[PDB]
């Protein structure tokens, strides 16, 4: 079903506050680049995991922007609720195959955190949503949040035109 067509669900996690901001930008270039008004952000810390991870629609969009945590934090539990939905038997298997589909946007700090944990729980979120069953519109996208902010903003917005082009073939 045509991108234009669908109901688009901006998920977000944020301790801090700055990928809430991020996640209204794409939702705005994304509103005013498909001229929709079907276009929802949700943070996963107010949300029921299940009803959205459990089972999912054909005319139905996830993108997921998640930034990483080393400590531990509600994130953990998002990816948790995940694992469990991947790995119990009284859920069926690939549960979100009729999703149109979902990509991941994950922010992280290189200059503190190169290496296994850059964008780690972003890295691990894209895992866990194609062993759900959902389609992967998009390959993974990483910001490095120390860049100049400019170059923070650019990099998300190249990820948002390439997954509305993506979308678009
Ligand atoms: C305590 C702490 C731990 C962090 N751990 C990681 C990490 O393991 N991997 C990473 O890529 N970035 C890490 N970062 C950088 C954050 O992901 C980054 O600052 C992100 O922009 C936070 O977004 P928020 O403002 O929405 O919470 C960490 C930052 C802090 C303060
Ligand atoms: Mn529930
Ligand atoms: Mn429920």
């Known amino acids: 079903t045509d991108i234009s067509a669908c109901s688009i669900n901006i998920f977000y996690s944020t301790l801090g506050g700055s990928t809430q901001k991020f996640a209204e930008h794409v939702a ?83 200059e503190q955190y190169a290496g296994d944990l850059f964008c780690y729980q972003a890295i691990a979120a894209d895992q866990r949503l194609a062993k759900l069953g959902a389609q992967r519109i998009a390959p993974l996208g990483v910001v490095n949040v120390k860049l100049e902010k400019a170059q923070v903003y650019e990099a998300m917005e190249a990820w948002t035109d390439l997954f509305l082009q993506y979308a678009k073939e």
């Open 28 to 110: 705005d270039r994304i509103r005013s680049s498909l001229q929709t008004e079907l276009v929802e952000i949700l943070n996963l810390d107010y949300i029921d995991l299940d009803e959205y991870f459990s089972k999912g629609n054909s005319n139905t969009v996830y993108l997921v922007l998640l930034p990483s945590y080393a400590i531990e934090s509600s994130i953990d539990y998002f990816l948790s609720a995940l694992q469990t939905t991947i790995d119990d038997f009284r859920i069926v298997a690939r549960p979100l195959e009729k999703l149109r589909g979902f990509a991941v946007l994950g922010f992280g700090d290189f």
